[model samples]
Target chain A: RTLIVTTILEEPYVMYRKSDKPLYGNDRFEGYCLDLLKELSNILGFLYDVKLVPDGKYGAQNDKGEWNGMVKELIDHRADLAVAPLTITYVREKVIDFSKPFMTLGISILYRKGTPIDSADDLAKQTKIEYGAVRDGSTMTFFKKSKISTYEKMWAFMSSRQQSALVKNSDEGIQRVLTTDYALLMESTSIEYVTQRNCNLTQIGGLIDSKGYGVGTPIGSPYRDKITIAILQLQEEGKLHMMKEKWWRGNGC
Target chain B: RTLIVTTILEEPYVMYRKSDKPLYGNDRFEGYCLDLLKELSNILGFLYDVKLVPDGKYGAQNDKGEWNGMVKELIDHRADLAVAPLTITYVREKVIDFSKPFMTLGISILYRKGTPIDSADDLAKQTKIEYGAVRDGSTMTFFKKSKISTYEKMWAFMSSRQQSALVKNSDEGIQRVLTTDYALLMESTSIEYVTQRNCNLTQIGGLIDSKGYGVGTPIGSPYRDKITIAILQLQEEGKLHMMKEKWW
Candidate 1:
């Protein structure tokens, strides 16, 4: 049977509601993913429906990581394919298969201006850190590799050198850097856009690395390599890169 | 040209020291992995040898898991394959392609003579958790899924109640649980053997999930499926089943 697909209301990725006259869709999802979800299924030869499940239920389903979308969903097969911008990390990769990165999220650390954080590695070494918040996975790899114990009580001591800067948005990472004298935040592409968008903040330096976003698939499937090849072909035809510039960069999402 | 890869000692997995004398030639090594290594080289049409390298370097080389292995020679790419029973876990899987589990391991909880924790979900109800340890992944799936945190959420801090139960190892968990109230020790069969030496713990539950031991191969390996299929073939012939009976 065709599976029910789930995603979020995040901008550029998946849009929820519409206000601007030209903006498409009803009070539900509308964005790049909505477009890609249609295209990918068309290419893969499947017909599925996209629906706006509750954000809490969406998170719960993905967290259990078994089913398509429910808080305790996977805790019971509430999810099938999460078509959002699912970045492949080690923890999530074990339970699922990511085709390869569709987006290049280059992470970095933005220090509270007066604080000393030239890179993510520096945040790990500093003992007197006020706040050290990065998205869950990307730059966290660098922290763990650097042995900068971020999670737990150690952050209390580091952030005490300043204040907590943990944020939900990429701009928050950038904003915290500009506003706080001690907090440090690290993130990728979005920060680049935010720093450029907002007059208050600026990017200190370059990115960690341009990451490869991928399609998530079931583990041990023989179809993984073939699917990745198809995505790459789209890249070769300029469709992949064209989409990124058209949506993520152009739309400022 | 063929390369003679040497392995260091890993007691139960692979050990070819001066103590064990049956093998002494340029191809001196021991264990089921050795036999599989030989067959692999023959099929791949390459000359490969297995040997033990220096100690401690195996660990240091895999620090970043760039070139995952016990021997530093593999990191330098000098060794084709190390014939050690390298464990297959998420940590090691990050860097290498491990063969099918040469062995089977599932999580089981052990307790003193007999207390509670009779089933997997039993521990969720208790409050005075003395020490509950399970290998990071095995029992954690169950503990986090239990959903009994509602009781604690009613009393404990709203956010604090959302997160409950500390993840720990079987040895420490068994030790703490034995001395205090209830301890949930989640671990594999190896711990079952290790804890048998001193503690009065018993296996109270069955294996958690089928975590088969696999041979570690470098990622992007052409031999990955080949090795997997070979293991699958061996299992069909009943050779693997017999080996399990013997080993277990």
Candidate 2:
């Protein structure tokens, strides 16, 4: 038997924390990662329980070299490989091994009417964006390690709303764009998508290459091999693109 | 009895000889000019009939001043006024008066790629854009009216095309653009409409000029005074704006 582990973040991308019993290919729990695990588990032989935890606390526990939350369940040796967007950054790379990016995004900028940010580059160069990350749920540690901060004066002038903390996910960023004036830095695909849908909004400019999500595991975990192979199979078969389009809606909910 | 006095050369705007359309309330006929006429008839207190006629005969019989196609039908005593996109230039103004412009358009440029003519000014000076006009339509007229010698050169060039004369209307013009890498020069409204409907196009630079169109009536027609009043009435009430939105 194996203890299945994971994290809870974006919705549709990952949802539900109950026992796994398979689901329809709709909004319920039939996400790409979740389904992949269910199929793999049937082959490998495993019985598991799902748990929900705030990512901050989950990280603290996982940092102990012990998997407490879904991901920690693996590190702590309580469970095995499982699913989630399992977002992976370079800094996180040193701490853990991640599967090839399951999905990629180009960051876009969201701003309120008076936020004073125009292009994504401007957001990068100003501290106002960093201030936004603070107000959002991005957490302090995430921003300090954010690949986006490398571009503009991001670290110094970010006000509360401008900081990454305000943006919990792409959804929040887009909502910020639609309802408020504070421009958010998010994926270009999302911006293009919503702009096309709304027609009223528009993409600011170019895209920035930042971190992408992947299937992560404890550093050097045996699960890395199987996950990589699964990813390749899914990609070659066009399942990856299908999953990307189906799942990427910004704001997990 | 309404007669269909029309330049069958134009289309989607007006099609001549399509009897199935009934011309009275059919889609194309009842749209722009017909709608204006319906309103004008009600206001002007006249039970004039609407019908279609050939452009050649319309202009010819009306040469001595009798009603014919849209232009001649109004100027000559054949019909009350010609309701079409009659270009109200100074020369034509001297002969007949036009109503408030219902629509406006310009002789735009279309090229397969790497436009040979740079601008309208250049076109006026060069014999290049002489490609034939869509069959029976008016773009050729604009080309020939060029104030310079290039106009005659263009006419010579236009007459040389093999199949360019067969194009019926803007739809065929679009087909030409697609089959060839040609960029189409058409009225801005048509471009907007086709683009909105997603026929694979892109709008070019700013407008050339604010071309005004109006009901064409002979300078001496008794109907001009009443027709002008009705056009102004429609404009003031914003009915003209609503009509435009309904069509193009």
Candidate 3:
């Protein structure tokens, strides 16, 4: 059956390109997931159309327990499959099915070139190690806006340094930390991969909040079986790894 | 049934506390998620066991299609619920169910105390505004690592003229910007909080991508409804917001 594959416009995975020339069909876009989808289509012998998620969200539950993002599209039968960097989580599984994970990821810290802080306690011990956090990130605003008595004190410490440590955007923090003693907290998967190119920088501490990207379909969608089989075959042939290596670390940076 | 909730040890969210005196059970640990869990259990009126994800991962699917970390625990039926700072994403929702988002976040840029650079276009326009990225930051690595020509070109722009711009860590970049002219690329959430006390630094640009964190439960778990209800109650009573401030 002709199918609709929902995706999000993200770098390296799915992106929108403004073409001077008239682009047709999937030709208008290119990225990691697109290539994977092409390969999957070739293997599964199905025709499909790629569309972006209406809400631009990966997926999250509302207070009423309704799903949004591509997951919602699939659940509501608006799309036949989801092709993006959709993470495979327990909650998502209950509502939909996913292909084998195409990529693995985790949370990690991004500090400056040289500093003595890796783990949280390590920073707590040292007053010299300056840290930068996004103003609006869950870790930041969550604590800053939180009311828990402990969090208030925690927020106090985080808010104390203000301008010296308090910066906006990851790059802003990334820049300031380069010359001074600062740390940038972020995900591990991206950190490890980016380190390949930027030899001067490095990742410290272990990864946390690990996750995977998967191709998704509605719950019990028959296409899931075929898609999963195709992914497995690609895995056996090392195609999946090859694709990631090509698209993920292809820049060598 | 007593639900086994799997979580990871993260700062402010889930942390291992060191006390001169011995602490046991839930008391052994403290943080945002734990406090939320206590409130949840109190509301749901259920006995539960909380444990760490054996592999110390939030959860990621491997090349072999097998899940690792907390996700695997849920898939294998080892955990009935997962309460942590676990982000709610499309792929995860397919395999499990999540309650309403407890927190919202996204990827953002982190620069020095003062720099006009905010957006990518802003940096490209500035000749004097130098920027640095961790050679291997989880977020930086993923974007720079992508095969897309745009990212490749972006990395080239960052690395090419950056003989002076490239640095080792966030503070190194921070130091450079203090003494020299430079910017550091990093997440917004952490940057935002760190900014509270820091008067010398500030954030630039807008959020790159936004997401949220939710309590996770295995597929078909009977407790999903009850847990969701408790979270909703917390939200309604302002308890959720109060707890988030306490430990996050």
Candidate whose TM-score is highest: 3
Q: What is the DockQ of candidate 1?
A: 0.01
**Candidate 1 lDDT score relative to the true structure:** 0.49
- B1-248 in candidate 2: lDDT tens per residue? 55333433343345444565454433434456677777888986666545555454323222454434455555555655676666544335545555434554445555443454455446446443333455434445444444344545655555565645335566777777657544455656666666666545555554343244557666555565456556645543456666777766
Q: Give the CA lDDT, 0 to 100, for residue A51 in model 1.
A: 50
Score chain B of candidate 3 by TM-score. 0.74
Which digits, one per residue and each the tens of the lDDT, describe model 1 over residues A1-253? 6755645555566766555655433335666666666666666666665655554323212344443432223223354555665544434444554553445454554543333456544554555554555534344333333322333243444335343445554446555566655444454555555544555555555653333345554556444544454553443234555565666553331
Which scores greater on DockQ, model 2 or model 3?
A: 3
Task: Looking at model 2 chain A, report the run of 10 residues with the lowest lDDT sum.
Answer: A131-140
Flag the better candidate by lDDT, 1 or 2: 2
CA shift of A246, model 1, Å: 1.2
Looking at candidate 2, what is the lDDT of residue A172?
Answer: 63
Which is better, 2 or 3, measured by lDDT?
A: 3
Residue A27's lDDT within candidate 1 is 35
Docking class of 3: incorrect
